[PDB]
Amino acid sequence: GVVAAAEKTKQGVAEAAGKTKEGVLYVGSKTKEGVVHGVATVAEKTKEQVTNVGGAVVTGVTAVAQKTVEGAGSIAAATGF
Amino acid sequence: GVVAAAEKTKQGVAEAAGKTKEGVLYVGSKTKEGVVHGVATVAEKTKEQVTNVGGAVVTGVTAVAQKTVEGAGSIAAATGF
Amino acid sequence: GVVAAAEKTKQGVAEAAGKTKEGVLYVGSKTKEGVVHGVATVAEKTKEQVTNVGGAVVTGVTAVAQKTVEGAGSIAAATGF
Amino acid sequence: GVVAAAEKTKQGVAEAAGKTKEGVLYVGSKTKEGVVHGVATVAEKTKEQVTNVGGAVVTGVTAVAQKTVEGAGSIAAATGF
Amino acid sequence: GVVAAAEKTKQGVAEAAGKTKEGVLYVGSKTKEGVVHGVATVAEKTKEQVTNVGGAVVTGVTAVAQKTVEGAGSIAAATGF
Amino acid sequence: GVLYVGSKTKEGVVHGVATVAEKTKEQVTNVGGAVVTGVTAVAQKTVEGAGSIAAATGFVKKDQ
Amino acid sequence: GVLYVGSKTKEGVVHGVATVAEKTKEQVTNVGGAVVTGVTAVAQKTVEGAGSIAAATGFVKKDQ
Amino acid sequence: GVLYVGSKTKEGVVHGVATVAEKTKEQVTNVGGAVVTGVTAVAQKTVEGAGSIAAATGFVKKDQ
Amino acid sequence: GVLYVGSKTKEGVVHGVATVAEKTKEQVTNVGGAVVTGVTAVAQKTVEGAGSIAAATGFVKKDQ
Amino acid sequence: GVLYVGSKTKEGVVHGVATVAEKTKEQVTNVGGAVVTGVTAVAQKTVEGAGSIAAATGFVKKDQ
């Protein structure tokens, strides 16, 4: 039994709410998951060599956002039998 | 039994809500998952060599946003039998 | 039993809502999944060599947004028997 | 039993809603999945060599947005028997 | 039995709420999970060599945000039988 | 020898203005004045002139 | 020999203005004045002039 | 020989203004004055001039 | 020989202004004055001029 | 030979202003004065001029 009321006013507002469940607000928010940012470099001479044989190799600048549910999550997996 | 009321007003508003469940608001928000950003480089001489044999190789600038449900999630997978 | 009412007003509004479930609002929001951005480089001489034999090689600037449900998700997969 | 009412007004509005389920609003929102953006380069001399034999090679600037349901999703897959 | 009321006012507001459950607000907040940021370097001569055989190798600048539910989560996994 | 290769430039730009008004009541009673309550995006590059208003919103000018 | 390769530039830019008004009541009674209650994005590069208003919002000018 | 390679620049920029008003009541009664209660984003690069207002919000100018 | 490689620069920037007003009551009764109660983001680079207001908010100027 | 490689610079920047007003009552009765009660972010780089206000908020100027 909720009641509001205004009378003999020049500017009146009557708000009446019985039950309320507010919700989530993301205002101007930020989120970063698995991020690289601003990787500056100055190298007069650069050399990068990779010699992979039957394996997994992951080089360079990498960013990964990985959600696995029922499996083996990895970035570089190698397996033999 | 919710009730609002306004009377003898020059500007009146009567709002009456019985039950309310607010919802999610994303106002001006940002989200980054698996992102690279601003990778500057100055290299007078550069060399990149890769010699892969029966394997997985992942180089360079990479960004991955990977959602697996019922499998093995990876970036570089190698397998033998 | 929700009730609103306004009387003898010059500008009146009577809003009455019995039950309400608000919804999601994305106002001006952004989202990035698997993104690269602003990769500047200055290299007077550049060389890139790849010699793949029976394997998987993934180089250069790559962005991947990969959702797998019932399979092995990867960026570079190699398999033998 | 929801009721609204306005009387003896110069400008009146009577809104009455019994049940409401609001919906999703995307107003001015953005979304990026598997995107590259602004990849500037200055290289007085450039060379790119690839020598693939029975394998998978994926170079250069690539962007992939890949949704697989019941299969192995990849960017470069190699398989033998 | 909640009640509000205003009378004989020039500017009146009558708010009456029976029950309220406020919600989460993220206003201007930030979050970083698995992030690298500002990795500057000056190296007149650089060399990077990797010789992987049947194993997993993960080098360079990497950022990973990895949520696994029912699997072995890793960055570099190697297995044999 | 200038070179623009894929460059960008924004001079006097209004970009990406989003707005939502949901179930908002509103009652205005204006008498000889200005009442602004809506979206308004103005973008200019050059506005040159003495005694000149370059962008006005809800303005009331009564001089002598 | 200038070179712009993928460069960017923003001079006088209003970018990404988001706004939400949900279930807001509002009652204005203006008499000969200004009332601003809405979004307003102004972006200018050059505004040159003596005695000049470059951007006004809710302004009341009554001189003699 | 200047070189801009992927560079950025922001001169006079308003970026990312978020605002929410939820269930806010508000009652204004203005008489010959200014009342500002809304979002307002102004971005300028150059504003040159004697006796010039470069950005006004809720202004009341009554000179002689 | 200047070189900008991935550089950034912010001169006169307003970035990331968030605001929330939830269930706020408010009652203003202004008479010939200024009342500012909203968001206001101003960003300028150069504002040159004698006797010039570069950014005003809730201003009341009555000279002689 | 200057080199900027991934550098940053912020001159006159207002960044990340968050504000929340929850269930706040407020009642103003202004008569010929200034009342500021809202967010206000001002960012400038250069403001040069004799007798010049560079940023005013809730100002009342009555000279002779």
Number of strands of chain A: 9
How many separate helices of chain A? 0
Shape of chain A: elongated
**Biggest interface, residues from each chain:** A-B, 81 and 81 residues
Radius of gyration over C-alpha positions of chain A, nearest whole angstrom? 29 Å
- Structural category of chain A is mainly beta
The oligomeric state is homodecamer
Fraction in beta strands of chain A: over 45%
The termini of chain A sit apart by 73 Å
SSE string of chain A: EEEEEEEEE
Region (4 X 11 AA tandem repeats of [EGS]-K-T-K-[EQ]-[GQ]-V-X(4)) (chains F, G, H, I, J): 1-32
Binding site for Cu cation (chains F, G, H, I, J): 15
Sequence repeats (chains F, G, H, I, J): 7-21, 22-32
Modified residues (Phosphoserine) (chains F, G, H, I, J): 52
Task: Describe what this molecule looks like in 3D.
The structure is a homodecamer. The first copy, chain A, is 0% helix and 48% strand. The first copy, chain A, has 81 residues and is an all-beta fold. The radius of gyration of chain A is 29 Å and the shape is elongated. Chain A starts with 5 loop residues before the first strand and ends with a strand. Chains A and B meet through β1, β2, β3, β4 and β5 of A and β1, β2, β3, β4 and β5 of B. β1 of chain G pairs parallel with β1 of chain H. It is classed as protein fibril. Keywords: multiple system atrophy, alpha-synuclein filament, protein fibril. The assembly is decameric. Multiple system atrophy Type II-2 alpha-synuclein filament.
